[PDB]
Amino acid sequence: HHHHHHMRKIYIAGPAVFNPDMGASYYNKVRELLKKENVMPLIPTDNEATEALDIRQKNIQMIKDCDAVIADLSPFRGHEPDCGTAFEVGCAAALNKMVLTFTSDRRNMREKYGSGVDKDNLRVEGFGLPFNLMLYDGVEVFDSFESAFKYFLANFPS
């Protein structure tokens, strides 16, 4: 009786932090969705430090502490995902964490750029993926945070 109970935790990776509201609207939506399932969101801006290295270390620790990352790999400042988010996905991959990704634009990279090269003649990947192939681990690329979260619930039970 009164055994320890693990509360599931998801690291909320993505460029919402750069919204004018520092991601408040996104994180609030995430908080409400996860609350219903007794899942804790690990949010990049929580208890935010002032020094870059401290912010970075705390985020790395959240990834170490999580059961899954849900990463927003939507276009950021062009057709490419946010590099901070990409770093976090790599961290999670190395730590053998469940990584779930979504994007607002699921078109292949070559469809996005409209060619096999960009405007400067740099190669656009041709693997039938919406973004850099390093970011794809075989799990479906979802359309939304919600759809990724449904996969989490089905595949990481309490």
Ligand X SMILES: O=C1Nc2cccc3cccc1c23
Binding residues vs ligand X (CB under 6 A): 17, 44-45, 48, 55, 59, 84, 125, 132-134
Q: Would you count residue 123 as binding a second copy (CB under 8 A)? A: yes
CB of 133 to ligand X, least distance (A): 4
DSSP state for residue 74 in the 8-state scheme: -
CA atoms within 13 A of residue 36's CA, in its CB half-sphere? 9
CB of 11 to ligand X, least distance (A): 11
DSSP-derived secondary structure for 95-142: TT-EEEEE-S--S-HHHHHTSSB-TTSPBPP-SS-SS-GGG--SS--B
SS3 27: helix
H-state helical runs in 1-51: 24-35
Residue closer to a second copy by CB (options 77, 150) is: 77
Q: Would you count residue 47 as binding a second copy (CB under 8 A)? A: no
64-103 positions binding a second copy, by CB under 8 A: 76-95
Task: Find which of a second copy, ligand X, none residue 47 binds, CB within 5 to 8 Å per kind.
Answer: none
Interacting stretch for a second copy, rule CB under 8 A, among 33-41, 100-108, 122-130, 141-149? 122-130
